[PDB]
Amino acid sequence: SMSVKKPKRDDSKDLALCSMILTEMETHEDAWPFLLPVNLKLVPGYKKVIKKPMDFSTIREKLSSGQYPNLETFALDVRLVFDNCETFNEDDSDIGRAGHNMRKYFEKKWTDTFK
């Protein structure tokens, strides 16, 4: 509360470390469904159904331009990419399986880097 603060967690490396995680997600072999925004002219249903589209390139541009106020807003956009994927793709599809694999990969890196 006013003039009463928990000890200051060092957040000065968060930007660099989220960049590194994002590089590792970009270079994973199952990243291909997630590298670029879904083409809303060419994929019937996507625009109406997926209210907040997100992809790795969009996260990379937001990261690079100071549009994440803290490491939690960064994790929320990464998870959004996988939540969108599960909303639109059957579990038993190449893209569905890609999404589950990438979410697992992300969540381990996240825990090991920050928890």
If we measure between CA atoms, which residue out of 110, 25, 101 comes closest to residue 59? 25
3-state DSSP of the chain: CCCCCCCCCCCCCHHHHHHHHHHHHHHCCCCHHHCCCCCCCCCCCHHHHCCCCCCHHHHHHHHHCCCCCCHHHHHHHHHHHHHHHHHHCCCCCHHHHHHHHHHHHHHHHHHHHHC
Method for this entry: X-ray
Range(s) of the domain holding residue 91 = 1-115
Is the Cβ–Cβ distance between 96 and 89 less than 8 Å? yes
Please report the resolution in angstroms.
1.8
Vertex 75 angle, CA 16 and 112, to 5°: 65
d(C-alpha 15, C-alpha 45), whole Å: 35
Q: Closest Cα to residue 87, out of 52, 37, 58?
A: 52
**Which CATH number covers residue 95?**
1.20.920.10
State how many domains the chain has: 1
**Residue 94: left (phi > 0), alpha (psi -120 to 50), or beta?**
alpha
